[PDB]
Every structure is written in structure tokens, then in C-alpha cells.
Amino acid sequence: SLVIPEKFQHILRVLNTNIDGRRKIAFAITAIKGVGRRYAHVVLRKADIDLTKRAGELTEDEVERVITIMQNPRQYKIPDWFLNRQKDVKDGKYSQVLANGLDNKLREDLERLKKIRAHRGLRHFWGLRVRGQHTKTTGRRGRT
Amino acid sequence: KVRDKLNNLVLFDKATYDKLCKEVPNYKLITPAVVSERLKIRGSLARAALQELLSKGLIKLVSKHRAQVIYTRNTKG
Amino acid sequence: TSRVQPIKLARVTKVLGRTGSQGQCTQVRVEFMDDTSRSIIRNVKGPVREGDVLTLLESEREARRLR
Amino acid sequence: LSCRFYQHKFPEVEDVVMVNVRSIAEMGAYVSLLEYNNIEGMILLSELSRRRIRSINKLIRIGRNECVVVIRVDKEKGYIDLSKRRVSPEEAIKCEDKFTKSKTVYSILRHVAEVLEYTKDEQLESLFQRTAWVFDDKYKRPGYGAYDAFKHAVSDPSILDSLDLNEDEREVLINNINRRLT
RNA sequence: ACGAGACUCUGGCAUGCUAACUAGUUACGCGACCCCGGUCGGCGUAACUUCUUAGAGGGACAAGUGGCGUUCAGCCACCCGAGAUUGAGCAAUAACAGGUCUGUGAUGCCCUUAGAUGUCCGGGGCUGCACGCGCGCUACACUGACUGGCUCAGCGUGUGCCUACCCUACGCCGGCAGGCGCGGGUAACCCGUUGAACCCCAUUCGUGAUGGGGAUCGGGGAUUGCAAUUAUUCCCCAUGAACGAGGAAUUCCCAGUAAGUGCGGGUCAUAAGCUUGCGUUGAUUAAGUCCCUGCCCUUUGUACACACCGCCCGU
RNA sequence: AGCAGAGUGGCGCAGCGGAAGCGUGCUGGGCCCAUAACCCAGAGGUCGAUGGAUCGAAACCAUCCUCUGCUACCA
């Protein structure tokens, strides 16, 4: 129990990123780019895994079920308003992206804005603020 | 001026368990802070070990609080 | 140095005016307890009362003015 | 791994030391004696200069070492009062040379210690006692009795092997003295 | 004679006075639960002002005692005592080349007056960034962060003339921001006994730029308005940067005070990091000085008087 | 053509195993009613280059380059 179990995996290699095993499973999975604190509790509530265990002693079948909940969260009855990427301009699907679709889709959206020549794209290309705030007094780390 | 970044173990290895079971009930004041300092473990891990020792009956309760708890050894007589 | 001066404790008799550059010091008239006839003046920092006994590390100096 | 340079835990009065300054306070300033295992010291504000200063960091220069003289020490309590005003200009070169010999002896013995893999406070003090403090007490000089001993022992292995520390550790120390001290 | 004082408002008490179904208290009956007695901001009605509301009067004056003082003005400590220095309002002569012609159908002179410096419509701008400065907000954590439960206020405001735009209990739908038919208040009656926050208790976290910190940025959904793009605002999930208690210097304050913490009003169709009020928790230090920065009075000095930020000598 | 010194912030310089500083120049802030003096902070560094010893060199090793101190066209 409180004694370290056998084959206690220290470093977890999940989705070509580095994950510590010493952290709580509700917080060690938050180190993956794209997933945060709030959506982590839902995933470990759909899967029958308690929140009182560390990430370093879980095994292949439960972490494989959690990876299935990562990749296909829709048919495990996760509500549609809980997602980060909804109502796509390319195909119109509800999906959750985990750092690869997230990074390449953010890059594709930024080049889409730069190609479409909207002023949001021009401000992202120039390297300024887009949400419409004052630049006169702040943003002093822009350029030398 | 040595840094010595502490890397506390998240669970007990072999030597920590019997070191605790032989030395912690032989100390005057027991709190999870001084257990984490002497035995280089985590704060919550010390709390779980102290709850186990309280359930075993080798430690008496003094006062409980949401900030810290106070534990002491048994009388040697 | 090489000499341990024994600590003597003295009680005030009358408070004088407040000395110092900013007026933070005070002149007091202390008296010794091993022989209650001797009265010297010392510089004190802080509020003092009448009948307030003070500890003295040395018993040889005399009180100087604001400078 | 670190310890004191010489065998004395705290230096005597009227002794020159080179000290590393750490922070500046109101009544004094917090420093660290690099040759006495970074113990707490105090330099006085009026003792920094004999003439009128214009700023505190004219003579503070946080992070750079300086030369001081111990005015009053307390061996039982661990307090050393330092002095900056009472120093001669001719003492700086000799203090720097003594610190150079002490720091190269400490670096050579630290290298030999990490080769020999002896990581303990008491064992490291025993290695210092069997390596440098024995010849320091033999030559009756706190610092000047060591660097001349390594300079002689670089050419005299019989003088090198006079201390009965070990065999393989003695060979490693002789190799380090031959390679470094040339 | 003016100024100070004197005067007014507010706080601090009075079981004495006047009074209350738009404020309650105490008794009585009924009803509900439990083990003979407790709870009811449940229902209803016989006295009363103990709580509340606000009117008139009272009370503190150096009044007493012991000292200091020319024993004169006054000062110090103590007892009885709700207070033996509560806070604000008003605030003199003289002048400033102080600010306001963008508060005014208060205003002299000047400019302009039909291709207008009047006026109106549509769009934009006042927000645009190598950089510097001021007022402020959030933090740099374990005197803590998150999650549940327990639990306590006071100032206020509210359906407007052209002027349409109010505050809200209650029921359903939806995670939420929100939406519809329903009832009250033109106000001590309704929101409302304003179930406020900080605090209190119990888990989770364990010195790790970490579950601190929430900047930047992507996608989606509602509200206001004719109209949001240079995101009005709000909500949901992601994104998690700097920042490890801050150099020279400098601001405010001494008692319910600083500080922490939230709630009202002003702007308001949409609306507070500002301001003005209010309440809760609640300290450290000091009863002094003229050293710094300045102020009041007397004496003295002056080659100054648009007045030392003055005047003035020489290459 | 031969032997030695120096190679470090725009400029001059200290340094030799645990490790980018000094004086000066520039920029900004404070102090003051303002300026000059005074104080604070920062930018600015292949430490001339090559390969190697060493856990680790701007320094140790061999070479070259640039400017100087002495011989000078020595057939």
C-alpha cells in the first residue's frame, strides 16, 4: 500500500511527451498540452479510476482506457459544451485536441488569417495585441 | 551557501518504514512537518503514515486542526 | 577590555528634560541600591516612569548633552 | 562537499582573513568567511572607511571578496567582529598569495576526494587531517607549511609518502600533485 | 470691530417624559416535532416601550480632592463618573497677471457667416506604438490555495416631463451566462430578518515557476443597442508568460486609527481597477523634538523692493 | 630574415584551473523651482585562431596572424 509497489513506473511516456509519476493522477495528466485541471476530473470520473492514487502505479489497461477517453471523448457521454474546439470552420465537428492537432490547427488558423488578410492576421504577423487593448503604456518587451 | 534542492519520495521504500517504526514513536513532538524534515518525505505522505500509526494505537492524539496536528510518544512506564 | 564589569541596577528619582537631536533621549537621575546615597545622571532611550528601576552595564560614565 | 581550510575552527585575534560579503544591514553587514566554512561575520559601518563616504555601495560591492582583520572573536558562541579600516597596503599581496595556495590545495584535495569517492563530513575531515593538517602542524605554519610541502613532494615521493593515509588514495594524491603542481 | 472662540450637524447615555397593525417585546390560545418538559422569522389577539423609530428636556463645567504657579490667569494626577482632548461645517484684511470665454440666452473686442469656424447625415478618430513618467489593481504563497458546512451588518436606491430607460420575491427550462407567463413597491409595508465578504471548522496540496500567480492567445454560447471589427459586457473549455519580498529615492498615519475585507451612490441602453459614503475584523510604536522640509512673534544686518528664482565684479 | 612583449566592453588595463571585471564613454531615473555637481541602474565581450592533455582553460601545450623592443642589404 504505502510501501512502493513492484514495477512502479517512474517516468510515463504517453503521447510522445514526458509525464512525471510522482504527481496525483488528477494533476499529472494535466502536464499534457491541451488538457487542464477542469477536464481532468471528468475523464477520471467516466473511467472507474479513483482520484486518491498517484500516476506512478497505474498500469496498461487503465491508462489505455484513459487514452481512449482522450482520443474519442464524445461517445463516453462527455457533454458538448465541455470541449475546447467546437463547430469547426473546416468540417464542423466537435473534438478535443491533444497538442498535435492543437499545435498544427492553431498554426493553420494563424496562416489562414494571414492568407485571408484580416486585421487579426496582420496584428499576429506584426506581433502586436489582437483583443483591442492599450499598447501605449504596456508591452515594453516587444522589440529592442 | 549550498542550495540542496530537496527531492522527497512520494511513497516509502524499505528503510524508511522501519526507520519510522523504530524512531518516530521514540520522539517527543511529532508533527508532519518534522516527520517530513527528518525522514525526507512528502507532507501528505507523513500525514497518511501518522494516520496509520494513530489507527494502530501507538500514538495518542493531543489536538486536531485543519492547519496542523500534534502527536507525542507513549509513556515508557 | 579583559575585565567583566558587574551589572548594577539603579532606580530613578526625578526625570529631567528630553535631550537629543530629535528629542528621543531623556535625562534621568538614578540612584544605586547597594549604597543609597549616590546619584548620577544617565541617557535613556524610551519612556520612563518615576520609580522605574533600570539596569546599567557600566556605572562610571556621566550623561553628555544632545551632542 | 565542503569544510574549513585550516585545522582551526575559529581564527584568533589580530589575524588577517579574506571574506566574501553577502548583504548589507542597518547596524552592520552579513558576510561569509570562505576559509572558515562560510560562518557568520559582521563588519561595522564606521569601520568601512577612515574618511567620509558618499554611498553604502562605494565600499560594499556585494559579491566580491575583501580583506579584513579580526578585532574581537567569540569561540564559544561563534561570533567574529571584522575590521576593514585597520589593514596595511602591503598585507594584500601576501593575503592573496596565501588564499591562492589555500584554494589550490582545497581544489586539489576536493578533486582527489571525488576520485576516491569519500562523501562524508567526518571522513572528509579525516582526509584533511591525514593530507594537509599533519604537514601544517609539522611545519608549524597555518598555510605556509602546506604549499611548500606539496612543492617538495612533487619531486620527492619519499617525502610524499610520509603520511600513513592509504595506498591507492596516496597514489591518486601523488598523481594529482604531479599533474597539477608542476 | 473682524478672525479664533462663541454657533450648527453627527457619534457617545437616559429602564425618566411623549408616542406607535408601515417597529416590536411580554403574556394567552391554537397548530407542528420529540423525550413529563424544550423549538417555531408558524397562525391569531390583552398590556408595554425593555429592542427600534424621533421629538422636547437633562447631563461635563476644571465640578471635587492633592500638589505646582506672583498663589492671578492656568497646568498635572486621582475618585464618583456613558464621555475629564470625537469627527465635521462656517471660516477675517491684503493681493495672485493661479484656473475656467469648452457650465450658462453672464460677457467687451476680434474673426467668420452660404464653396460656412452655424447646422445635419454617413464613416473614421479621441484606444493608433522604439520609449519615459504619475495615480491605481493583482500577486510573488503553507499566518496559505482549493472544496464542502457553519455563521454576522450599516449607509443607501427604486417605475423619470419632452424621456421610451425602475428595484425585484416566486414557478419552469438550461452546466452557466440567460429566456417566458406569472405577484409586490411609487416605498419602515416589496426585494428584506438586505442568510455580504474577511473570519470559523473539516478534507485535498507539500517548498517544486507547484494545485502560487492569470498576463497573452484559440474555439463556442447568451445580453444591451439601429450598429461591436480596433474582441461593449458576461459565461464555458483550453493556452499558464513575467514575477523568488525589489536599487537611488519617496508618500500617508498615531485609536476603533493604519491595514485586511466586502456592500451602496455618482457616472449607466450595455457599466467600475476611479471617486464619495457605509459596515466587519482590528493592531505596532509615541505623549516628544527643531536635526531635516517649513510656519508664527521680537531684536539685529542689508548695495534687495517685478522683492535672493534679488543684486553684482573681472578676463 | 632571426629572439622576446601585447592581443580582453568604443578606448586603456587587471587575471591564471572551478571563474567577464575595473577606469572611461553612452542611455535612463532620482535629488532641486530648474541647470551643473552627487547618487543609482543597464546595454555593450567568438578574451585573435586552430587541434589536444585535463571531469573542466581566455591561462597548459605546438603553430600562424597583427603591432612593438634589438641585429640590419646577411653574396
Coordinates of C-alpha atoms (C1' of nucleotides) in Angstrom, one line a residue, chain C residues 18 21-23 47, chain E residues 286-289 291:
Chain C
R18 CA 14.4 65.3 27.0
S21 CA 18.9 65.9 18.3
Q22 CA 15.3 64.7 17.6
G23 CA 14.4 64.8 21.3
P47 CA 9.6 56.1 28.0
Chain E
rA286 C1' 4.8 57.8 20.8
rA287 C1' 2.7 61.8 24.6
rG288 C1' 8.4 64.4 22.3
rU289 C1' 11.8 67.5 19.4
rC291 C1' 18.2 67.9 13.2

